[PDB]
Every structure is written in structure tokens, then in C-alpha cells.
Design a protein around this ligand. Structure first.
Ligand code: HEM
Length: 153
């Protein structure tokens, strides 16, 4: 669905995320977890964390922050030819972590909140359009693999 024009857009904005990955990673997860509290319970690793504060204090959260965004960057760099790297993830997210497609919706809303918050004024209408689009693409493909595996429908 995306044009090069757009992918350029997508990879420029990713350059902001890369300057401080554990930084963007931490806030993504915190925003996910606070706005959507039910999501925290899918992690036996973070479930203990009631407060936000307590969350921001967590190096383990930060370290996950970095894994999550290191994996997406990888997909994103691939400009849609990502069957190779998304196959593994759709699998583990479906059958083992048992993460509903709607929680991937949420973190996608989260990546966008976080970029405005942290980049107030240099993440324009075009880049937001492009960022939205590659995150939907990521999502539509997991969705295809969830259907297959017959997980939630
Ligand atoms: C932006 C999309 C996401 C990416 C790229 C991603 C990436 C990853 C990676 C690479 C791992 C470890 C490798 C594996 O176990 O497959 C993982 C583990 C996990 N994911 Fe995700 N994730 C994403 C979204 C989510 C969401 C939205 C949830 C649920 C609310 C979730 C739940 C989990 C859990 C519970 C683990 C296991 C961590 C542990 O126990 O060490 N993931 N994630």
C-alpha cells in the first residue's frame, strides 16, 4: 500500500526513534499499559507494577522497550517485504503470548501518541499519514496470520 515517497517518510521519522530507542520504548509501553490496564496482565514480568512511577523506575521495562522497537525497526526497514521476520512474531504472539489483534491496535495508537509528545512540531501531517499506514500494514499481516491460526474471529 505505501509508495517510496511514504516509506522515505516512514524511515526519516524512524531516525528520531533510533536516537533514543530505550527512551521511546519505555514511553510506548507505559502509555500502552496505563491507558489500557488489561494489557499489563499479559506480562508475568510487569504485572507487579501498579504505578506509572514504578513503571518509569523499571529497567526491565526499558530493556523490553528496546526489544520491541528493535524488532519493529527491522520490519519497517523492510518496506513491506517482511514475511520473513513477521512470520515468527505472529506465531509467538498468537499461540503463546495469546495477544488479541486489538492490543496491536493499541500499541500502534501508542507509537503515534509518543511521537507527538516527544517530537512536538516536527512530526507533520505527511509523516503521521505515512507512519499510520505502515503500522496498519504491519497489523493487517499479523491479522492474516491470526485468521490462519484461527485465533480470534
Ligand atoms: C509493536 C508490536 C510488537 C512487537 C514488534 C513485539 C515484539 C516482541 C518480541 C521480539 C518479543 C520476544 C520474542 C518472541 O517472544 O516472539 C516479544 C515478547 C512478548 N510480547 Fe511482544 N511485541 C509487540 C506487541 C506486543 C503487545 C501489544 C503485547 C501485549 C499486550 C505483547 C506481549 C508480549 C509478551 C507478554 C512477551 C513476552 C516477554 C517476556 O516474557 O520476556 N507484545 N514481543
Amino acid at each position: 500500500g505505501l509508495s517510496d515517497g511514504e516509506w522515505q517518510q516512514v524511515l526519516n521519522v524512524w531516525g528520531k526513534v533510533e536516537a533514543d530507542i530505550a527512551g521511546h520504548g519505555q514511553e510506548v509501553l507505559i502509555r500502552l499499559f496505563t491507558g489500557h490496564p488489561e494489557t499489563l496482565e499479559k506480562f508475568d514480568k510487569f504485572k507487579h507494577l501498579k504505578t506509572e512511577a514504578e513503571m518509569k523506575a523499571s529497567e526491565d521495562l526499558k530493556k523490553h522497550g528496546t526489544v520491541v522497537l528493535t524488532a519493529l525497526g527491522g520490519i519497517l526497514k523492510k518496506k513491506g517485504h517482511h514475511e520473513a521476520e513477521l512470520k515468527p512474531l505472529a506465531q509467538s504472539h498468537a499461540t503463546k503470548h495469546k495477544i488479541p489483534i486489538k492490543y496491536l491496535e493499541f500499541i500502534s495508537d501508542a507509537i503515534i501518541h509518543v511521537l507527538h509528545s516527544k517530537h512536538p512540531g516536527d512530526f507533520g501531517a505527511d509523516a503521521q499519514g505515512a507512519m499510520t499506514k505502515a503500522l496498519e500494514l504491519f497489523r493487517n499481516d499479523i491479522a492474516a496470520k491470526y485468521k490462519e491460526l484461527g485465533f480470534q474471529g
